[PDB]
Design goal:
The structure is cut from a larger assembly and holds two copies of chain A. Chain A is about 0% helix and about 25% strand. Chain A is extended, with a radius of gyration of 15 Å. Chain A is an all-beta fold. The interface between A and B is small, with 6 and 4 residues. The complex binds 2-acetamido-2-deoxy-beta-D-glucopyranose (NAG). The PDB classes it as viral protein.
C-alpha cells in the first residue's frame, strides 16, 4: 500500500560456497510509510 | 526603474496595525501518500 517493510536475520556460519542447509525465520527490523514505487534494486558494497 | 524590494520600517513607538507581526502558516495536505504527522492519541490510566 506504500508502507515498505524490511524483515531480516543475522546468524553464524563456517561455509565455503553455498547457502546453509537448515531453517531460519526473519524478524521484522524496519517498517516505513515511504509511498514510493520500487521497480529495480542494486546492492551497495565497499570497494 | 525600481529595485524590487524595500525595508519595512519597524520601531517600538508604532501603533496597532503598523507594528511588526511574527507569522507562520501550518501549511499541509492529506491522503496522496500514507499518513505520518498526526495529533496526540490521548491515552488513559490502565485497569484490570
Ligand atoms: C507516488 C506515485 O507517483 N505513485 C505512482 C502512481 O501515481 C501510479 O498510479 C502507479 C502506477 O504505475 O505507480 C505509482
Amino acid at each position: 500500500d506504500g508502507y515498505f517493510k524490511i524483515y531480516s536475520k543475522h546468524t553464524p556460519i563456517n561455509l565455503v560456497r553455498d547457502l546453509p542447509q537448515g531453517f531460519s525465520a526473519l524478524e521484522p527490523l524496519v517498517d516505513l510509510p515511504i509511498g514510493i514505487n520500487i521497480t529495480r534494486f542494486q546492492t551497495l558494497l565497499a570497494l | 526603474c525600481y529595485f524590487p524590494l524595500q525595508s519595512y520600517g519597524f520601531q517600538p513607538t508604532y501603533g496597532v496595525g503598523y507594528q511588526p507581526y511574527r507569522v507562520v502558516v501550518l501549511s499541509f495536505e492529506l491522503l496522496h501518500a500514507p499518513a505520518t504527522v498526526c495529533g496526540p492519541k490521548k491515552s488513559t490510566n490502565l485497569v484490570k
